[PDB]
A paper describes a structure:
In both cases the oligomeric state constitutes a dimer of trimers.
Diffraction of the crystals reached a resolution of 2.1 Å and the structure was solved by molecular replacement. For the other 3 chains it was possible to model the lid domains with the exception of only the terminal 1, 3, or 8 residues. Interestingly, in the two subunits where the lid domains were in the closed conformation, the active sites contained electron density that allowed modeling of glyoxylate molecules together with magnesium ions. Soaking of these crystals with propionyl-CoA resulted in the additional occupancy of one of the two closed active sites with the CoA thioester.
Residue numbers in the entry:
A (entry chain E), E (entry chain D): 2 to 266
B (entry chain B): 2 to 265
C (entry chain A): 2 to 315
D (entry chain C): 2 to 317
F (entry chain F): 2 to 310
The structure:
């Protein structure tokens, strides 16, 4: 089109704070946090038996709580589960206009996003919803990274893409520990001395390139070690250096760390 | 894999009898016909205001009537409508195991079929349905025929593909109001005399090639003029010659005509 | 996208009148013709040594003549020629904003259109042109028909696509006579009796499908026999039936013929409106299907009737 | 690349005469025929128990017989059979330089041709063969026509592509009779009258488009009715009209019929020369517009004249 | 498919032990080794004049020796050589059912594997072979890594995919020394201090992603320095961390090292 | 094709020396340098108001100066600018046969190169230019790296491909300092200590793979810190290791540094010739593999040693 890359969404995304839908007592705290994006979770932080109740809890929270200027997103279950369709139907039929975004996990190709888009669009039209939802996806599988560009171009709704390093590692068969960060066995040996390198380099850089090509925000995923502030800082700094615009917080203390690294200047 | 093309489903598909879901009085008449496949319709034979009730009737018929050995299909609404998702959700959640198949209309690419497959599969798993549904699709748009092969390879559930000449003509901007058959203004002029040619040749042939490549049944669609048996025979014969295995009946009289042409 | 297929340009395109840019004495009459689109030619109707002058003539006509409500287009030389870049540079630098469109010949892939788009866009920006040109292309080669869909989706500027039967046949190695129309040696023999069929069926239909998929106007090309009005009517009727919206006029006589065919007859229109009324009545009765003159009509029939109507309301 | 479409091989291909490799007595007659291309068959005209012997026969025929100016091709068995690899290996290891080409049947995708190319290339290198083989392929399946362009672009060796109407119809599940030609049940009905149309239109046109896009010769396949001479002519004329350059002969009578349709008449050649001479004379006087008897000539009208003259000189 | 990614072959592949077919006196030591996979070589460890004899040796070895529970593979010559067809023809026509697998070198596209598949399938059918051969391929060229996913999906026979660092480096025009491992000239300079990084990161990660997407086993290739046990461990650990399941042994004492790193807990 | 990968152009490309077309007083110094390739710039080193003059300057320099055996290239403006078409038209219509190459910046897809190829080919035919121009491109955007293989295969004119790390970083939204090199915030933390890693790894390797697949020269782009020779050396050495054959010089002093790194050392070539000799001896006694200094060495090492020599 003889201008370069499309501009990404202008909204801040320095930090996405996650909380399980099964704990409504956390919602007001999340709303009061310094996080730019709130992720209410129906997926991995919620046991299968609790998913139906968590779904109801989230719908009530969306309709009943003051979320301020925060971007409100919900991580639904995967398309390889029986839960995902009910997540989408109930959310789009019952949740009010305050809902901003849906997060789709384990995306492995463009058609996965198209599928959710097909369903979401129909319900929006059926219910006469005035504010169209945006999409964000998680790259957390071999298929996801292998198909990262087609996924980035898969929907006009798409605004963000996250790397889920833990589930990515599991999918890739990576012999890693914890969630993200330095890996003990990934180092170069030179004259008896060890130098640790970045085992996530390609996955992060490819995600960034795919996102920037198609006007999407690339985002860094969870970091597991809550007691390692400097580990988080290093991980976030690497991601920012590679072009990512923010990082998940799965613990309240991580929000300040993410804001420290990702706030522009 | 260095073998011949995939084998198509072995089930009979000589004729598919259509009937609006808003006319439940037709259902037992359809069930008693000589049609191999029964298509209960929620789409273009049903007014928008009646689609919700038509859906309720179809579910009742699936759980209520004796369909014998018929292949029981339901044509849902298109993905560009607000009706399609409720069609699928209600059917898979409420209809018993007698439902065999759903027909997806106005398919423009493989992702459309993938989208329905995503939804259907999740509900089957959630409800523990023992008999997985098959799919059939209609090629009835410009995009459809342009992407016919990718559509033919779009799902393991896919068993059949029909050419819908009515919507196809509209989408293509074809100057006509008739449904299939001979076109008055499509002829060759040689030394004063006119010779009428087949305006549907490529569409049908492309569909057959796509279907045979991927082990799918290619089917001819609706013939509008139910007062013209010889017109129907001509259309059905052309389709058979091109490799299609059957044809829709949109009226009881057409069922006998279809079986005449397509019975091996 | 989950929407209707992209709507084509609403502008009329029933007839495209061609005229060599080397003959400016005809320009005035073309402007006063009944053609919806005017095509001033720099390509095959102009000898190589006459191209430079024809280029200057066309630019002068774009700036000087009153073209009324005509859609003004120029056919440039192909990307396989040394002429094309000078055609585009001179037109975009020297011609005023009355120029609407350029026609690109012998298009074989999406990249050909993109190449012209790249040049045109840079010059429009450099000169600050206020009305961006639209593109139309000619499918007149084997490569063209084989890659027809990618060509249809090659540029936001693209508004129309023509089948050039004479050059298509040459490229395909077709043993044909004249330009388009019935071919003597293309017939079916049944019981010693011959039945002529359409040797252009796939090319036309595939172009229509590609165009309609991407919101482009499919157009029929030149018909060579100027003395055969009924032959022209036959060719135009086949095109209109397959979905094409208009046809070239390479002779002033053909303009009236094109407009007659590609404007829906009064009989066809009245039938379309009755079907709409019949379907509208069935809706109020709570039915999506009913009977019209002994044949089935339904919701899909509404959209077919709407095809006939909007072309007549043009 | 900003030039005209790739030029096809500059050799005549009006008729390809087939003969089973199990019948070596026919070989000298084929070599003496008026066919441009000779196809010795290892495939469907040869029974499974005769395939090994036919392979030996063909190899001897290539090494021992005088084939004159004929383009010598061998149709091997398909990649879905246990025979194909043995066909290629024995041919490329044992046959002399006189072998020009191999024909690959039932090609469904580009990778089928690539597979054969990989094998053929390695044996040519191992044996030090001096004249590399060209390929030709048969489109005779649904997969083949669906993937026709990718097949056309599948190999630098590829020179020709045929439509096998009978096997194509069987693959497509077409309810047809015989091999090619008019089909009884494929007609248009108007006012009680029937008009028969072409049930092979797209298959033929698409093959021609794919071939001409990639510099390949598009060829029409077998016609079954050996007594229907006018049926053959009609089929050949349709093919010629759609852009095919030749047709198979599976019976010696068909050779004359094929050459008749695909050779320009002496009248057409003469008129073509005159038009080109008129143009040349005009340019000699520095004129851009040519005039022949009647009026003015379109550039496409001289384009075909040059094609016709080029044809006549290819047949010497 | 709305299911998890395809499961890889279940068989062990911690170590692949290579040996030139031109040295049949070493075959019994290989059969007795602790390697899961045995690779009898007809390619780059056999001089051109010795290839015909090595072929006969291997065929005799397949029919003659006790291979126990070893997965028995043969690396044939590449499709750019005149040797490959004779390698495959003789193996499939003359070797018994003890042969498990063929290793295809220098694969640059999916069509390369299809070509070998076409030939193997024909002979298996002609000879009525009871146990169909599996395939493994080596990614050891620029074309290979560029087309790694299409190669991973190239055949139902494909079970494993190896990175060949020696040929890869040559094909890529890498100014490297030795085979794999730390590269002296690949380091980051920070405040007059050198930090060596992984010059093989993308190639290894991309291979793992392609393999896991399509149910293939990703394998690390040869490590040249025999005398460097710690260097081997470092290379093996990096590979394991990135998701590879095993590594070649081109010297007998590398088998134990590979098993130490790749044996699952 | 069943052959080895296509061979790249054989011409030297150890260093590409850039100079703005707006400063013709520096041209003669460039022609006197030890740089293999000369890049006269119409793009980012030239302000918009100077572009037309620089165009005229460059044309005069091409027709007027002695460039010896240098490969003479001109970096035109991008396809997203109004300047590019006039750069091409003027150069191809007015510059003499001494011009060798045009460098296209910000290439995002194959069609970009095709667009320039279409224009260049037509003018060459119109003017009857006897020496067809080659192309080189810069991968300096997200789209460029995502589509890097299709770009590398986009034209028979294409001979070289550069990574432009600064503009790449900007497009990618990378939080980096300077141009290329070590990045302060890109490090691994292990028990309290930091280990810096390569934030350009995939970009460089992917460019090399795309290039080598299609017979193109992969080249490393600008390095910003002119006072940091060791910094330059580390960057050049990483690139050479990954397979890049040369590096830009944007300051005159960088030419020697590029030549030093991208001319294989006598130590490296002696070790290569030593390996080749060892494998001749191995092959002579019926061995496809042998031992070299406690290391494995076989037929694969031959092509490796040949890359060196
Ligand atoms: C072209 C685009 C498309 O989408 S077409 C695909 C979907 N279309 C349809 O489903 C249309 C099906 N057709 C119909 O709705 C009806 O046949 C139409 C055309 C409306 C005519 O209905 P009607 O006037 O009742 O027919 P008729 O009087 O001639 O009835 C004769 C006897 O047969 C029955 N009948 C009628 N239609 C069906 C049917 N589809 N299936 C089974 N039976 C049918 C009628 O009851 C009547 O029977 P009886 O003798 O009273 O027992
Ligand atoms: Cl994760
Ligand atoms: Cl034309
Ligand atoms: Cl046949
Ligand atoms: Cl830069
Ligand atoms: Mg997860
Ligand atoms: Mg319809
Ligand atoms: Mg033309
Ligand atoms: Mg056959
Ligand atoms: Mg190797
Ligand atoms: Mg730049």
């Amino acid at each position: 089109s003889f201008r370069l890359q499309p501009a990404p969404p202008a909204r801040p995304n320095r930090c996405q704070l996650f909380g399980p839908g099964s704990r409504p007592a956390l919602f007001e705290k999340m709303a009061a946090s310094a996080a730019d994006v709130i992720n209410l979770d129906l997926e991995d932080s919620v046991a299968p038996d609790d998913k139906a109740q968590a779904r109801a809890n989230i719908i009530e929270a969306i309709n009943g709580l003051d979320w301020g200027r925060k971007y409100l997103s919900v991580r639904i279950n995967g398309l390889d589960t029986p839960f995902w369709y009910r997540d989408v139907v109930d959310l789009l039929e019952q949740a009010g206009d305050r809902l901003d975004q849906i997060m789709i996990p384990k995306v492995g190709c463009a058609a996965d996003v198209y599928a959710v888009d097909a369903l979401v669009t129909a319900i929006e039209r059926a219910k006469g919803r005035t504010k169209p939802l945006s999409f964000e996806v998680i790259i957390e599988s071999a298929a996801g990274i292998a198909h990262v560009e087609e996924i980035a171009a898969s929907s006009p709704r798409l605004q963000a893409m996250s790397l889920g390093a833990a589930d990515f590692a599991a999918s890739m068969g990576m012999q890693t520990t914890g969630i993200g960060g330095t890996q003990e066995n990934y180092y170069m040996l030179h004259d008896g001395q060890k130098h640790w390198s970045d085992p996530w380099h390609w996955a992060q850089a490819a995600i960034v390139a795919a996102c920037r090509t198609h006007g999407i925000l690339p985002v860094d995923g969870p970091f597991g070690d809550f007691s390692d502030d400097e580990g988080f800082r290093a991980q976030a700094r690497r991601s920012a250096t590679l072009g990512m615009v923010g990082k998940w917080a799965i613990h309240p203390k991580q929000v300040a760390l993410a804001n420290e690294v990702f706030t522009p200047s």
